[PDB]
Design a binder for these strands. Structure first.
Length: 364
RNA sequence: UGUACUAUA
C-alpha cells in the first residue's frame, strides 16, 4: 500500500527511522527509473535532520545508501551540515558507519577539507582525538581517514599523538596501538620522525607494555629509521638489556633488535655505511652483556629465547677485523654455554640450546 | 618453554 503512493507524497523522514521503511527507500534508490527522483525528493525533506539520521539505528543505513547516489553538490551540503559534529558521530555506534561511508565516497578536496576542519581543534580537542583513536567505534573513522586521505591532511592525528605523553595513552591501548601502526605505514617520513621522538622519549613505559612492545618492533622494521634508531634505543636500554630480555613483552623487542643487527651487518658482507659501523659495535657490546649474564639468561623463562636468537648461526654464518672480534666473542659464548648445559638438565629447552651449539660446531 | 586485531537492520 506504501508502493501505491506517488513518490511526491512520501513521508521520507518517517520512513528513514523505520526499519522496513528505510529498506523500502534504499530499494527505490536502487531502482534506476526512480533513483534520481526519489533521491532528490527525499534529500530536500531530510536535510534538516542529517545529524539525526546519521546517528539513527535505521537512518544510518539510508545515509550510507545515499552516498552512492548523491550529486557532488548534495554531498557537499551534507558535509557542510555535519562537519562540526565529527567527534559525536564517530563515537556513535551508528554514526561511525555513516561517517566511514561518507569519507569513503568524497568527491573532491573541498569535501575532504571540510571533514578535516571538523577534526581540527576549532571543533574537536586534542583529548577528543586521543579518545577517538582508542574508542571502540571511533578508531574505525580514524583508520578510514588514514587510508582515504593524503598524509598532508594528517595534522590533527599527528598533533594529538605528540602532545605531552599521549604516545603512552595510545601505544599502550588495544585499539590505539593498531591505529598507530596503520598511520606509520602510510604517513610521511617527517611525520614518522615526530612520532618516533615521542616514542623514544617514553620508551620505558612502552618497551615492556603488552601493546607498546609491538610499536617498538614496528619502528625497527622501518629502514629509513636505521641511521638513528639503533644507536638511540641501545643507548637507552643497554644498562637494563639483561632485565629486558627476561620480561614477557620486551623480550620480543630484544630479539627483534638482535635479528635486525644481524640482517644489517650480513647484508653488507653479501646497506647504509654509517648504520653498519655502529651496528657492528652494538652487536659486539651485546654479546659481551649476554656473556656476562649467561647464567641468568640461559635459565630464564623468557631470557633463553633472546640467548638462542643470539646463538643461532642461521643469523650470522656469513660472519663465520670486526669478523675477527665477532668470531672470538660468539665462539667464547658458545664454549661457556655448553659448560652450563648440565646445570639446566631439568629445563625443557636444553635440547634446543644443545642443537644450537652443535649447529655452530658443524658450521665451524 | 613466551605477547595484541575491534565494531550496526
Amino acid at each position: 500500500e506504501i508502493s501505491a503512493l506517488p513518490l511526491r507524497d512520501l513521508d521520507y523522514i518517517k520512513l528513514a527511522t523505520d526499519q522496513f521503511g528505510c529498506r523500502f527507500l534504499q530499494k527505490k534508490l536502487e531502482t534506476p527509473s526512480e533513483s534520481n527522483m526519489v533521491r532528490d525528493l527525499m534529500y530536500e525533506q531530510i536535510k534538516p535532520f542529517f545529524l539525526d539520521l546519521i546517528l539513527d539505528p535505521f537512518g544510518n543505513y539510508l545515509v550510507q545508501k545515499l552516498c552512492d547516489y548523491l550529486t557532488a553538490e548534495q554531498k557537499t551540503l551534507l558535509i557542510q551540515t555535519i562537519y562540526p559534529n565529527v567527534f559525536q558521530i564517530s563515537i556513535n555506534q551508528y554514526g561511525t558507519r555513516s561517517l566511514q561511508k561518507i569519507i569513503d565516497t568524497v568527491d573532491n578536496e573541498v569535501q575532504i577539507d571540510l571533514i578535516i576542519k571538523g577534526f581540527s581543534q576549532e571543533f574537536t580537542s586534542i583529548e577528543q582525538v586521543v579518545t577517538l583513536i582508542n574508542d571502540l567505534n571511533g578508531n574505525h573513522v580514524i583508520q578510514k581517514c588514514i587510508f582515504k586521505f593524503s598524509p598532508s591532511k594528517f595534522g590533527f592525528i599527528i598533533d594529538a599523538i605528540v602532545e605531552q605523553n599521549n604516545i603512552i595513552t595510545i601505544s599502550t591501548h588495544k585499539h590505539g596501538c593498531c591505529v598507530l601502526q596503520k598511520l606509520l605505514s602510510v604517513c610521511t617520513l617527517q611525520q614518522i620522525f615526530k612520532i618516533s621522538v615521542k616514542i623514544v622519549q617514553f620508551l620505558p613505559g612502552l618497551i615492556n607494555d603488552q601493546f607498546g612492545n609491538y610499536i617498538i618492533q614496528f619502528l625497527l622494521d622501518i629502514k629509513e629509521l636505521d641511521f638513528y634508531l639503533l644507536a638511540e634505543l641501545f643507548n637507552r636500554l643497554s644498562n637494563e638489556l639483561c632485565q629486558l630480555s627476561c620480561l614477557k613483552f620486551s623480550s620480543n623487542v630484544v630479539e627483534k633488535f638482535i635479528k635486525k643487527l644481524f640482517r644489517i651487518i650480513t647484508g653488507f658482507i653479501v646497506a647504509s655505511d654509517d648504520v653498519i659501523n655502529a651496528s657492528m659495535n652494538i652487536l659486539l657490546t651485546t654479546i659481551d652483556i649476554f656473556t656476562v649474564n649467561l647464567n641468568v639468561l640461559i635459565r630464564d623463562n623468557f631470557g633463553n629465547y633472546a640467548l638462542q636468537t643470539l646463538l643461532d648461526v642461521k643469523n650470522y654464518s656469513p660472519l663465520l677485523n670486526f669478523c675477527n672480534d665477532f668470531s672470538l666473542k660468539i665462539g667464547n659464548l658458545i664454549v661457556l654455554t655448553k659448560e652450563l648445559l648440565p646445570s639446566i638438565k631439568t629445563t625443557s629447552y636444553a635440547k634446543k640450546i644443545k642443537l644450537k651449539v652443535k649447529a655452530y660446531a658443524e658450521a665451524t
